[PDB]
Amino acid sequence: TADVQQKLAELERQSGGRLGVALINTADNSQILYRADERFAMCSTSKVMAAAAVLKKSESEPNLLNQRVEIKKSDLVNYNPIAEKHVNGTMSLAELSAAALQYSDNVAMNKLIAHVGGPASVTAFARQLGDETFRLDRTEPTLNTAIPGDPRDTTSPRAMAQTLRNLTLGKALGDSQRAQLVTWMKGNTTGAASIQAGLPASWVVGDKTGSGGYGTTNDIAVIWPKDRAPLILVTYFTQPQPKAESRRDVLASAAKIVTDGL
Amino acid sequence: AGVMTGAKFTQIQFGMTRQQVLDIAGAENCETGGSFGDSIHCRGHAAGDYYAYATFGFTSAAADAKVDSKSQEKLLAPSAPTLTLAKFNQVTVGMTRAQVLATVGQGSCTTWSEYYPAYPSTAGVTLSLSCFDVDGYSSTGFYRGSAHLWFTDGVLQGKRQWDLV
């Protein structure tokens, strides 16, 4: 509706930034789109794609998630709450996927990226899923610079919503792999202040947030509303000042606007 | 009162028991088990996609076990950050900790991780410093000029930097 568009435009204007939203309602395949074809830096929301690339690989190598990966001091990057425990030891690919998705562990992310062959290989996975917009160019931490106008490590809300639908609800992954991805995302340790804060408490959410330079504040989610078919919601937000503080509440506000009435 | 903080992290000492750590950190902020094993992980304020935090490792799983490892992110600000890309380039693998600190600035670094595998002995100590340029540190957001310097037995084993100038 034009009403929802005006409310999102007003939220964006009040926030001072640039807001991108894509909602898919799988009950009727309807969408709500706001700047949905513009590019936004994904920041840690890209961890979903990297974990999914490893899950896809595991369809051809079913013991893959149990494979061990060495963690060394040279691998450390900021936001390493899980990997730091295992320096000079190992973590399984399952542990790395869970750490990336549930603690936003950036060392875990870099191990997932490296496992599939590097950022271009994650992009190639996106292409294999029919996503022509996603591009992963860098590893952590530099993928989070979020410089306005820089297309590196960006996607569009429309593309990410369709891809997240295909991964979490559709057939992009095998049944067991799709279930594992959803299980991991349902266990994220944050997200409560982002999309979830704009939704009724009874709704079940699997999400992944992202944050970066320029006050970039993102969240992508699969949502099971009470007594309803699931939704996919992508909310991306970025700001003009390099040092802007995060605005998770803007994502909550966008989520409330686009789900009002469900 | 409140979440995990840098002041609490500094008050916690190597050699303290689990309950001494919880006395200072505030057990409402802390957890064990799961991904943290028998360590104690304590959350500070929301930051990025997680939280500022500390993780404390102990000499064993026992109740009388002592802190042998302290790790943190975003709890401690550098006291007088003066690191630059030139100074980072002056740091050389094989330098001692004292030589590195004189090079990067005595107020540029905070301790990211510090572990004594032979606690209370210092033999085998491993140390990771997170070091920052004048405006690189942020307790909530994306770093804007930082470096990781790591040591074993007080000797620099490697260095990495992001966004120094």
Numbering used by the authors:
A (entry chain A): 27 to 288
B (entry chain B): 1 to 165
Kindly provide excerpts from the paper associated with this entry.
The BLIP/CTX-M-15 complex was determined at 1.4 Å resolution in space group I 1 2 1. As expected, BLIP binds the protruding loop region of β-lactamase, and the BLIP Asp49 and Phe142-containing loops are inserted into the β-lactamase active site, consistent with inhibition of the enzyme. In contrast, in the CTX-M-15/BLIP structure, Asp49 is in an altered conformation where the carboxylate OD1 forms a hydrogen bond with Ser235 Oγ while OD2 participates in hydrogen bonds with Ser 70 Oγ and Ser237 Oγ. Phe142 in the CTX-M-15 structure is in an altered rotamer conformation where it interacts extensively with the β-sheet and omega loop residue Thr171 but loses interactions with Tyr105. Further, the structure of CTX-M-15 in complex with BLIP shows that the 103-106 loop of the enzyme is in an altered conformation compared to the apo-CTX-M-15 structure. Upon BLIP interacting with the 103-106 loop, the hydrogen bond network of Asn106 observed in the apo enzyme is disrupted and the peptide backbone between Asn104 and Tyr105 is flipped 180°. For the CTX-M-15/BLIP structure, there is also a change in the rotamer conformation of the Tyr105 phenoxy group coincident with the change in orientation of the 104–105 peptide bond of CTX-M-15 such that the Tyr105 side chain is angled down the active site and makes a hydrogen bond with the BLIP mainchain N of Gly48 and hydrophobic interactions with Ala47. Examination of the CTX-M-15 apo-enzyme structure versus the structure in complex with BLIP also reveals that the Gly213-Ser220 loop in the helix 10 region undergoes a conformational change. The change is associated with a movement of Thr215 mainchain O and the side chain of Thr216, which forms a hydrogen bond with the mainchain O of Asp49 in the BLIP 45-52 loop. The finding that the 103–106 loop is present in the CTX-M-like conformation in the apo-enzyme structure of CTX-M-15 but in the TEM-like conformation in the CTX-M-15/BLIP complex indicates the enzyme can sample both conformations.
β-lactamases inactivate β-lactam antibiotics leading to drug resistance. Consequently, inhibitors of β-lactamases can combat this resistance, and the β-lactamase inhibitory protein (BLIP) is a naturally occurring inhibitor. The widespread CTX-M-14 and CTX-M-15 β-lactamases have an 83% sequence identity. In this study, we show that BLIP weakly inhibits CTX-M-14 but potently inhibits CTX-M-15.
